[PDB]
Design a protein around this ligand. Structure first.
Ligand SMILES: *[C@@H]1O[C@H](CO)[C@@H](O[C@@H]2O[C@H](CO)[C@@H](O)[C@H](O)[C@H]2NC(C)=O)[C@H](O)[C@H]1NC(C)=O
Ligand SMILES: *[C@@H]1O[C@H](CO)[C@@H](O[C@@H]2O[C@H](CO)[C@@H](O)[C@H](O)[C@H]2NC(C)=O)[C@H](O)[C@H]1NC(C)=O
Ligand SMILES: CC(=O)N[C@@H]1[C@@H](O)[C@H](O)[C@@H](CO)O[C@H]1O
Ligand SMILES: CC(=O)N[C@@H]1[C@@H](O)[C@H](O)[C@@H](CO)O[C@H]1O
Ligand SMILES: CC(=O)N[C@@H]1[C@@H](O)[C@H](O)[C@@H](CO)O[C@H]1O
Ligand SMILES: CC(=O)N[C@@H]1[C@@H](O)[C@H](O)[C@@H](CO)O[C@H]1O
Ligand SMILES: CC(=O)N[C@@H]1[C@@H](O)[C@H](O)[C@@H](CO)O[C@H]1O
Ligand SMILES: CC(=O)N[C@@H]1[C@@H](O)[C@H](O)[C@@H](CO)O[C@H]1O
Ligand SMILES: *[C@@H]1O[C@H](CO)[C@@H](O)[C@H](O)[C@H]1NC(C)=O
Ligand SMILES: *[C@@H]1O[C@H](CO)[C@@H](O)[C@H](O)[C@H]1NC(C)=O
Ligand SMILES: *[C@@H]1O[C@H](CO)[C@@H](O)[C@H](O)[C@H]1NC(C)=O
Ligand SMILES: *[C@@H]1O[C@H](CO)[C@@H](O)[C@H](O)[C@H]1NC(C)=O
Ligand SMILES: *[C@@H]1O[C@H](CO)[C@@H](O)[C@H](O)[C@H]1NC(C)=O
Ligand SMILES: *[C@@H]1O[C@H](CO)[C@@H](O)[C@H](O)[C@H]1NC(C)=O
Ligand SMILES: [Zn+2]
Lengths: 499, 499
């Protein structure tokens, strides 16, 4: 019988008690990255994260940081491989920058051979060290040209441009890459990119944020989400019809959270909690498992919710071999009004829920996850049991899928000096406590989880935060980015992997 | 009788001997800037100078600098006005960033109202201080979307997108702006952007520079130059047909140089010198004055030189009310082979000339202009008489045009400390020696020159050089960009203007 801790102090950093041998022999352990966050702009065209961070520097991070140079994995990809080799990792998730291989967006405009060569060399280097690549086609970095031609995922033109990009990736890299992710965190671009305008491309209703160049936060999230699902599904169909000889697997990436009632004896909070599951997870998992959006979304969102045709429904339903599930934290849910006629209405209001990290009796859900220095009542707290609850829910609700945990990690402040930054015991605690619950759910609930990739390989540009936080298991000096030095967490993870 | 110095030491920094009163009462004196170089990316979309500097950081400058934040004239435009007011300047040349007012490139995709407001406030502030705006529509910063959709000026689609952009500018700003420049330095994008790939977008033949993503240095410069002329001419026709009520004037910007024979008794060097005038100046001025390219270009370039239809010829011929002439330096010319079958052939080779700053007897043409620390035999030297020779030539060869000198200036090294940087006596010498010759040519040759704008108002991002050189008449601290402090040159220029 497995017992796992939910509160500080944690004792799962002892590899005598928790290590890779606790999991099945074939289980993959590694780390993750994304292209905007690590590569730099050298050698690629411009994408909407370049555009957004440059047009709206205060939205890029408090330091106005961006991905222009970052950790320079364009130059230092071998050093990334070296970290993975030091870890004895068996997996690495990275993304392909669309703008590096097709700078002009549309494949018929030509490819960048040198960009293709960059990923060939990375892939070959990984495989030579026994590391399985997990490759994200689209980690938010849409070529700027496509956003300017037709507003990107706002328009159905995205589907064929994404398909042709993906086809090039399968053609060039699929002989070696056997695990593909289509779109990173399906929920995020619709809501943050087109709802709150916290993320690229930065569209919203005028009264939500007067700096947005255009948008409608009530309608566009739904349009974009719908196009994401269709573009994803078209790529999965292309993969499974035209690249079956490659013997690989493909799936989407979800951001997952668990949700608990703010007041577990209040029917209204219980209802809000179940609505959140539907609106947060079901928005995408309903289509992916059934070809339809959840009924509560149909009912609430009404004419703002697009319909799938019968052909589209069939294309989207079942459009995965596995799910990449990202998991960071859990929220309490309580009811909230949905003012659909307000000029500041957002899609996110349609769930009719307010989310907190403290429940009605004043209980904080778990240890600190992210401090918010401008408003401490907005601090985020984590909840290790949430990974158990999410995986159990996916198994039970969503037809026992094959799952890889494609991100899980925690930040430390960029204000810490290097010695403090390397002494990242809070990261060991977060990672181990989640791994304990992941082992527990696999054993107790028989969830088909076959790997775990911690966020992040190394310090990088963090969307929305610049270089003001660090997520890496290895440390990068922003004054001299060449080295990636394993932190205490990376050293712990090395021991966990090879105990 | 006016006597002007050609060699150090110069004594024209004495405003007792040379000042604004030496020129006609109406003559405009000011300074110049461009949008990529000064504004920053905040509040605008991405353009090909963002793309180029980010994809090819070693081509942005030795420091890998770029226009992301620069002097932040987005925030500090009032401080630019303040410099101009301190100078008692009567003119200011600035550019509109296309990506700030139409981030999606094509006008039908929507405009950025806040971008429009930015230029309205600048323009209104200038006029309130008695400063005449000279506004460049296109200072190289093409929206990235257009380059990615159709490769920008490589394709005739540029013409209508440029026209619709210009129409928006005339509509929004032409009630106040009475001097418009279409395209900055017509020669530069074809040759550097599409020939040598030193400049955005960075296209060339594969053996010219293997880093180029695509291109053909032998053909594309000509295509791009042809489209520039057509796009320019379509905008001038639009202006003069639809905006005549505004009572303003429009013209192109030329980069001018003079050319002297490397050996003034050698017929081959004399011939190369005359070819250079045709290939450098006539490439554009032939079309602008006659609707045809120079015969030597027709003959040499052959099938690589596009033809104008009779309608196009008529549109381009006479498509200016004035010329903005930029002038920095003069070169000696000697013959050079034109290897049209070589895989590394460039359009620039078609002139059949090699350019130097030292003549056959070892004479350097004038004082140092720009030191090249990697190769000192590649140092640039200036030649004050060249402004006289250029203006005389334009009057005689090109039908006595109205001229404004739209740039003239010199750099100092970014390695200098602030006190050295503010003690910019080399800049006084360059500016005064050229102003002396400009007065001389107006008086002696009756060239219709009606203003002079020195490059640059303040230190900025220099194309190709990052922040490794400074051109400003006012100093900017890159650690805190708010202030623009007049250098010795700016203080001199203040006295020259109001002696
Ligand atoms: C807030 O969360 C706390 C902690 O989960 C809940 O308190 C638990 O309540 C259960 C059922 O009453 C008790 O058996 C436990 O002993 C309590 N745990 C502790 C740490 O107090 C609490 O019920 C939640 N409040 C609401 C209103 O939902
Ligand atoms: C190189 O440039 C120098 C300077 O312009 C030329 O020298 C001048 O030559 C003229 C005509 O012979 C003489 O009257 C001057 O006195 C010379 N000036 C000085 C400073 O020497 C020289 O002829 C040029 N060489 C060539 C080969 O063209
Ligand atoms: C080398 C090592 O320490 N391995 C330990 C193993 O002894 C322990 O029984 C298991 C518990 O899951 O964790 C692992
Ligand atoms: C998504 C998809 O199913 N299939 C395409 C098919 O249309 C195409 O004819 C063939 C060769 O290009 O490769 C495949
Ligand atoms: C240096 C190191 O740790 N190497 C280990 C190797 O001993 C072990 O057999 C393998 C699989 O567990 O993981 C790796
Ligand atoms: C105020 C002042 O110094 N003005 C001088 C003027 O006296 C002089 O005759 C002229 C020569 O061009 O330059 C100016
Ligand atoms: C370049 C040009 O000559 N002219 C246009 C004309 O086509 C248009 O009909 C009218 C109203 O848009 O404004 C003008
Ligand atoms: C402060 C200052 O220098 N103001 C001068 C003003 O005296 C002069 O009349 C005008 C035109 O020459 O230029 C300005
Ligand atoms: C940040 O930038 C936007 C312009 O993009 C401006 O609207 C907003 O006021 C600025 N935010 C703060 C908090 O200053
Ligand atoms: C607009 O929304 C903000 C945040 O969503 C809220 O605090 C404010 O009350 C809203 N105003 C109206 C008019 O509803
Ligand atoms: C930068 O870091 C690398 C790796 O430690 C080191 O070899 C190189 O000398 C350092 N550069 C400077 C300028 O210190
Ligand atoms: C600069 O960058 C390009 C890649 O864009 C590379 O081809 C070239 O070798 C580098 N130049 C030098 C001098 O290192
Ligand atoms: C290619 O050109 C470079 C510079 O243009 C020159 O130095 C070299 O000799 C040329 N090679 C051939 C094959 O002509
Ligand atoms: C930056 O420069 C401005 C103008 O001199 C000054 O007022 C401001 O205090 C300076 N900022 C810092 C942080 O020194
Ligand atoms: Zn940047």
């Amino acid at each position: 019988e497995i017992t796992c801790q939910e509160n500080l102090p944690f004792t799962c950093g002892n590899t005598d008690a928790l290590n890779s041998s606790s999991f099945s022999s074939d289980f993959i352990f590694g780390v993750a990255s994304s292209a905007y966050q690590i590569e730099g702009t050298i050698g690629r065209g411009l994408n909407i994260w370049d555009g957004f961070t440059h047009r709206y520097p205060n939205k890029s991070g408090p330091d106005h940081g961006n991905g222009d140079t970052t950790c320079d994995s364009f130059s230092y990809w071998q050093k990334d491989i070296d970290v993975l080799d030091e870890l004895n990792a068996t997996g690495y998730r990275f993304s392909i920058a669309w703008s590096r291989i097709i700078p002009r967006g549309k494949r018929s405009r030509g490819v960048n051979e040198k960009g293709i060569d960059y990923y060939h060399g990375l892939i070959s280097g990984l495989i030579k060290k026994g590391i399985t690549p997990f490759v994200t086609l689209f980690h938010w970095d849409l070529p700027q040209t496509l956003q300017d031609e037709y507003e990107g995922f706002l328009d159905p033109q995205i589907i064929d441009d994404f398909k042709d990009y993906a086809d090039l990736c399968f053609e060039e890299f699929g002989d070696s890459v056997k695990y593909w992710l289509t779109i990173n965190q399906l929920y995020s671009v619709p809501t943050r990119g087109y709802g709150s305008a916290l993320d690229a491309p930065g569209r919203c209703s005028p009264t939500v944020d007067p700096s947005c160049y255009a948008g409608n936060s009530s309608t566009e999230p739904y349009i974009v989400a719908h196009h994401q699902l269709l573009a994803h599904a078209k790529v999965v169909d292309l993969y499974r019809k035209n690249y079956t000889h490659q013997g690989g697997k493909i799936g989407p990436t979800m951001i997952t959270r668990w949700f608990l009632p703010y007041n577990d004896t209040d029917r209204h909070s219980i209802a809000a909690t179940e609505r959140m599951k539907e609106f947060f997870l079901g928005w995408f998992m309903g289509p992916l498992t059934n070809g339809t959006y959840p009924q509560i979304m149909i009912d609430t969102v009404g004419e703002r919710l697009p319909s799938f045709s019968p052909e589209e429904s069939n294309l989207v339903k079942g459009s995965y071999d596995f799910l990449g599930l990202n998991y960071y934290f859990t929220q309490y849910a309580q009811p909230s009004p949905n003012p659909v006629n307000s000029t500041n209405h957002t899609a996110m209001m349609d769930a009719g829920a307010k989310l907190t990290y403290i429940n009605a009796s004043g209980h904080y859900i778990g240890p600190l996850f992210e401090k918010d220095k401008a408003d401490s009542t907005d601090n985020i707290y984590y909840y290790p049991k949430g990974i158990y609850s999410v995986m159990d829910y996916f198994k039970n609700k969503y037809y026992n899928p094959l799952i890889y945990v494609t991100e899980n990690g925690i930040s430390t402040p960029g204000d810490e000096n290097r010695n403090q930054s390397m002494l990242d015991y809070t990261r060991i605690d977060y990672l181990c406590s989640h791994l304990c619950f992941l082992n527990k759910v696999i054993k107790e609930k028989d969830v088909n989880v076959k790997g775990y990739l911690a966020w992040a390989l190394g310090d990088n540009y963090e969307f929305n935060k610049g270089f003001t936080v660090r997520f890496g298991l290895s440390y990068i000096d922003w004054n001299n980015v060449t080295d990636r030095d394993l932190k205490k967490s990376g050293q712990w993870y090395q021991t966990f992997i090879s105990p």
